[model samples]
Target: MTEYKLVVVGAGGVGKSALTIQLIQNHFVDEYDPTIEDSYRKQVVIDGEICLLDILDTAGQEEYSAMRDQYMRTGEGFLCVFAINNTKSFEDIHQYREQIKRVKDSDDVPMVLVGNKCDLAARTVESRQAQDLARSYGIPYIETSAKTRQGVEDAFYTLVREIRQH
Candidate 1:
């Protein structure tokens, strides 16, 4: 069996966990509490393929400086996530990537820039801003909505396809 591990990172209340929940179990809550601290694991199948997704859901507001290197060192890809409603979460993405560097000691691993909470389109940050950030790091990018399950599945599958191709 082939296995893949990916980390979802962002500041707290950015729907990182919400996205994961929807992706893994089709779970979605109408009212989201921003104070919840969530970290867990789940798996899914894509395009008739079973993907063993080991998820490391990190707290968005807390510091996990060593964790980035620790996990990426295992040679797994990452989903550096951010919230559409908050700009600071977007800014913290740099630090997350830097941690990846510290752990892997290289910039060769695959990564995806995720703008979660796309369901809140009315309160969204600029898509161009997120795209620019991803482009700067030369990583894949996507906007997702956990409430509507839009781009939620594709975001994970896209990385898998890229991993398979390259």
Candidate 2:
């Protein structure tokens, strides 16, 4: 039962909690509910070991502010996701990017920019930005549709995959 701490950070209404729930039980939650951070802990076979995947949510991050300082500092990997329809949520990734790195002080932190909500129309954000296609930041990208279960599993699993390699 080795523990692998991972954090999913994003603006509210984004799919931070959605993807984690899908990973846990293979279901999607359409209703808006502030996540109970402790409620999402699951184990999966990864890295050729039974790894406990601890998914941290920023359900109250805006208010709590520094609530996840400790968690991010220790989290092995991170998924910085945003709703593709919500551009600001996508813009919000920059804050968490440097913020998390500021706390880690490492060049090899496993963080990926995820563009979620492809299941919906009117995409406010573009794929280029989502993929960080030409961004200066040394970040990777993945497109995820949490509701339709498209690439959702790939998001979390790949994050952990990078974690094990790192």
Candidate 3:
């Protein structure tokens, strides 16, 4: 089986941990808890090939910014997460992408721009805007709601496929 290392990152309260937990545990978390760094492992099959996926959930605190490069270098694929209700969080994804490019020394890295918290009625960042950014970066863009469990699985599945292809 192939081994894939995936990292999840974004601003605080943007639902990175919630999405990761939803993907791994099939449940949602109500509280907004900041993560330092958490690891999860699962065996998954994509395109008939069995693979072990190592997911790293990272903290979005500015103090933890120093560790992002290390996470980027070790990741085979990345999920650049942001909250749809917060425009600042959406804007922060650009920094994450740039860091990935600098650390990996490649602009063509496997990555997905994830817009979280789609369940909220008030959205500051529209899907079209995020999709346009993703298009400019040449990456896939997806919106997920950890609360309703919508598009959560597809985000990871698409990322794994991109990683394998890359």
Candidate 4:
């Protein structure tokens, strides 16, 4: 796992960039300021293995989602993110999952189901629901708060583990 390619995807304002930035920079960005597309590279030690992570933090806007196909084709793994407090973001997971599956042309692709914004109140996407979805997909499910930098590494490391298995 020298170079692991990953895509962080979800609906707009779902803290997609927050997750990415937190992973690479160890800080948070609090705003509507979403990235259209950003490529970030970092070298880290995961489970005593050296991995160079090439991450594509793609835009979740309606228009930019079509542009995501290019990255999906190249990405070896994915972090499918959704906000826990927003039902719509959680609903959008199906579309993201479908698009990745279609582009990869594989039923068993490396992917992780992520429910972000766990630090916020009023949870619309409960743990059970997300766990059920991950079980259906047969992938790992993780809860994260980019603002607090919780579970940031676990989600990414889990995806890398999936890639390793594949």
Q: Between 1 and 2, whose lDDT is larger?
A: 2
Please, what are the lDDT tens digits per residue for candidate 4 over residues 36-77? 788999999999989999999998987666667876689899
Cα error of candidate 2 at position 100, Å: 0.5
Task: Give TM-scores for every candidate, taking all chains together and pairing residue i with residue i.
Answer: 0.82, 0.87, 0.95, 0.96
- Compose the digit string of candidate 3's lDDT tens values, residues 37-141: 889999988778898989999888887556766765788889999999899998888788877788789878899999999999899999999999999988899
Model 4 residue 140 CA deviation (Å) reads 0.8
Over 4 Å off in model 2, which ranges?
Answer: 64-66, 133-135
Using TM-score as the measure, which candidate wins? 4
Count residue pairs with overlapping backbones in model 1.
2
Worst 10 residues of 4 by lDDT: 63-72
Candidate 3 matches the true fold with a TM-score of: 0.95
Of 2 and 4, the candidate ahead on lDDT is 4
- Show model 1 residue runs off by greater than 4 Å: 30-43, 63-75, 122-124
lDDT of 2 at 161: 79
Candidate 1 C-alpha lDDT tens digits along 1-166: 4677767766677787778788777888667555333445555676677777776666565543334435445647778888888888888888878877777677776788889888674655798888888888887889998889999888878776656754
Q: Give the C-alpha miss distance for residue 99 in model 4, angstroms.
A: 0.4
